[PDB]
Amino acid sequence: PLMVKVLDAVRGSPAINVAVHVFRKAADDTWEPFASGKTSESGELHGLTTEEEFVEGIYKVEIDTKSYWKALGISPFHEHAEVVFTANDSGPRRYTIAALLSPYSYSTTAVVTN
Amino acid sequence: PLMVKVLDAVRGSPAINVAVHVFRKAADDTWEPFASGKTSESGELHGLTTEEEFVEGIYKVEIDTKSYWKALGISPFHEHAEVVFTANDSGPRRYTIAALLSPYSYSTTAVVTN
Amino acid sequence: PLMVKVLDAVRGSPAINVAVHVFRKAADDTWEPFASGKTSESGELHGLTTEEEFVEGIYKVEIDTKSYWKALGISPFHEHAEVVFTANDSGPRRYTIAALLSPYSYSTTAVVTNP
Amino acid sequence: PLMVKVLDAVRGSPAINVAVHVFRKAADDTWEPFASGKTSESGELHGLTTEEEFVEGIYKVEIDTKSYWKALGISPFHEHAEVVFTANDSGPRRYTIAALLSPYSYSTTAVVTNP
Ligand SMILES: O=C(Nc1cc(Br)c(O)c(Br)c1)c1cc(Cl)ccc1Cl
Numbered sequence: 408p409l410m411v412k413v414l415d416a417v418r419g420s421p422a423i424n425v426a427v428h429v430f431r432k433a434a435d436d437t438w439e440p441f442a443s444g445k446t447s448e449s450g451e452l453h454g455l456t457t458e459e460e461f462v463e464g465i466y467k468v469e470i471d472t473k474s475y476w477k478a479l480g481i482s483p484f485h486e487h488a489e490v491v492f493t494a495n496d497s498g499p500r501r502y503t504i505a506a507l508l509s510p511y512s513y514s515t516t517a518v519v520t521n
Numbered sequence: 522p523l524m525v526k527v528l529d530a531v532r533g534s535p536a537i538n539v540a541v542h543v544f545r546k547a548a549d550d551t552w553e554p555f556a557s558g559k560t561s562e563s564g565e566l567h568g569l570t571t572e573e574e575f576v577e578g579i580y581k582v583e584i585d586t587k588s589y590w591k592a593l594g595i596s597p598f599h600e601h602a603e604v605v606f607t608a609n610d611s612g613p614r615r616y617t618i619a620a621l622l623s624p625y626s627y628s629t630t631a632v633v634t635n
Numbered sequence: 636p637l638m639v640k641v642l643d644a645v646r647g648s649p650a651i652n653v654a655v656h657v658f659r660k661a662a663d664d665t666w667e668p669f670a671s672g673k674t675s676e677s678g679e680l681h682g683l684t685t686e687e688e689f690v691e692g693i694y695k696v697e698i699d700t701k702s703y704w705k706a707l708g709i710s711p712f713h714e715h716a717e718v719v720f721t722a723n724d725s726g727p728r729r730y731t732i733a734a735l736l737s738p739y740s741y742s743t744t745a746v747v748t749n750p
Numbered sequence: 751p752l753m754v755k756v757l758d759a760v761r762g763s764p765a766i767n768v769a770v771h772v773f774r775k776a777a778d779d780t781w782e783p784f785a786s787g788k789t790s791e792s793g794e795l796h797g798l799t800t801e802e803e804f805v806e807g808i809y810k811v812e813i814d815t816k817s818y819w820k821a822l823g824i825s826p827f828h829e830h831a832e833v834v835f836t837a838n839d840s841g842p843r844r845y846t847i848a849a850l851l852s853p854y855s856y857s858t859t860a861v862v863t864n865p
C-alpha cells in the first residue's frame with residue numbers, strides 16, 4: 408500500500424540508490440522504525456510494507472538526499488527530506504509518495520488511489 | 522519514446538482525462554501537430570509516437586489544464602501548461618514529461634532514460 | 636501590475652539576468668509583443684508595464700530558461716518556460732509570476748492581488 | 751538572517767497566518783526550540799532571530815501546513831513541512847526558506863546570500 412518514488416531535477420533522471428526510511432509515530436510520540444530500502448533504477452522503492460502492517464497512523468518518510476547529492480559530487484542544502492502524513496482508511500488504499508530533488512529545493516506530492 | 526504523466530496536487534491523484542497535444546516545430550517556425558490523446562486512469566498517456574517518427578527537433582507538449590480544473594468545478598489561473606524542449610539523439614532514448622498541477626501553479630520535469 | 640521573479644534551485648540563489656518576454660494575444664489570434672526585460676540581482680523584474688497599458692487580455696510570459704542555463708555553461712532540457720493566463724477580466728489586478736528553475740525542471744506559481 | 755515565506759498554490763495568494771516553529775539540534779541530539787512565529791499578510795515571517803543568536807548548527811524549520819489548511823476548512827495530506835539544514839558553517843549567511851503549498855503537495859527552496 409506504500410510506494411516511494413524519487414526523481415532528480417538536475418540530471419533529468421530517476422534518483423537511483425537513494426536510502427529511504429519510514430517511521431511510524433508511537434504512542435509516546437517517538438518515531439519508531441517501520442520500513443526501509445533504497446530506490447531502484449527506476450527511482451522507485453516497492454515492497455516496503457503490506458496491507459496487514461500498514462495500519463492507520465502518522466508516518467514519516469525520510470529520504471537521504473544529502474548522501475545522494477554528495478555521491479554525485481554536488482553540495483546540497485538539506486540534511487534530508489522528510490514527508491510526514493496520516494494514513495486514513497476512509498481514503499483510497501494505495502499511497503505513492505513522490506519527491507523531486509534539486510540541490511537547494513525539493514517538491515513532494517501524494518498520489519492516493521484505489 | 523515519449524510518455525506524458527499528469528498529477529493533481531489538490532486531490533492527490535492522477536489527473537485523469539486531461540487532453541494533451543504534442544507539436545513539432547517546422548522549418549518555418551510554426552508549430553505542426555504531431556500527436557495527441559487524453560491521460561488514462563493512471564494519469565499517463567502512452568503510445569503517442571514511435572521511435573521512427575520521433576526525430577530530433579523542438580517539441581511542445583500542451584496540457585489542457587484549464588478544462589481539467591473546470592470539469593472539477595475549480596477556477597484556474599492558466600490557459601494551459603506548455604512544455605517546450607529539444608529531443609537530442611546524443612542523450613537517452615526515452616522521455617517522460619511529468620506535470621504536477623494546482624489551480625494557480627504547475628511544476629514539470631523530464632525523466633530521460635535508456 | 637506585473638512582476639516576474641525567478642529563483643535558481645541548484646545554486647540556492649536568485650536567477651539573475653534572466654530574459655523575459657511578455658506577449659498579448661491580438662485580435663487575429665497572434666502573439667503580439669507586449670513587454671520585455673531582464674531579472675535583476677534580486678531575481679525580480681519590475682517595471683514591465685503600466686496599469687493603463689495592461690488591459691484585459693490573454694498574456695504569455697516567456698522566461699528564457701535555456702539562455703539562462705547556457706550562459707552558466709549548462710546544457711538544459713527546456714527551451715523556455717511559458718506562463719499563459721487571462722488577466723484583468725474582472726478589473727485590474729496585480730500579478731506576480733514566480734518561477735523556480737533546475738536544468739531539467741521548473742515550477743511556476745502566480746500571486747494575484749486586488750489593490 | 752532567517753526569513754520564511756509561504757505561498758498558496760490553490761488561491762494564488764500568500765499563505766497568511768501560517769505557524770512556523772524553528773528548532774536547533776542540541777548537543778544531546780534533541781531538537782531544541784529556537785524560535786517561532788506566524789506569516790503575515792504578505793506570506794512572510796520576519797524577525798525570527800538575530801545574527802548573535804543564529805549560530806552555527808543544524809536547524810529545522812517546521813511549517814504547520816495541516817493547521818493552515820484545516821483553518822481554511824480543508825482536509826490536507828501532510829502533517830507539516832519540515833526543512834532541515836546546516837546553517838552558518840562557513841560563517842554567517844542569510845537564509846530565506848520559501849514554500850508553496852497545495853492540499854496534497856508542497857515544494858520548498860532556499861535562497862542563501864552572503865552579506
Ligand atoms: O509527478 C511527479 N513525479 C512523478 C510521480 C510519479 Br508517481 C511518476 O510515476 C513519475 Br514518472 C513522476 C512530480 C512532478 C513534479 Cl513537476 C514535481 C514533483 C513530482 Cl513528485
Ligand SMILES: O=C(Nc1cc(Br)c(O)c(Br)c1)c1cc(Cl)ccc1Cl
Nearest residue numbers: 733734735744848849850857858859
Ligand atoms: O515561493 C516561491 N518563490 C518565491 C516567490 C516569491 Br513572489 C518570493 O518573494 C520569494 Br523569496 C520566493 C516558490 C517556491 C517553490 Cl518551493 C516553488 C516555486 C516558487 Cl515560484
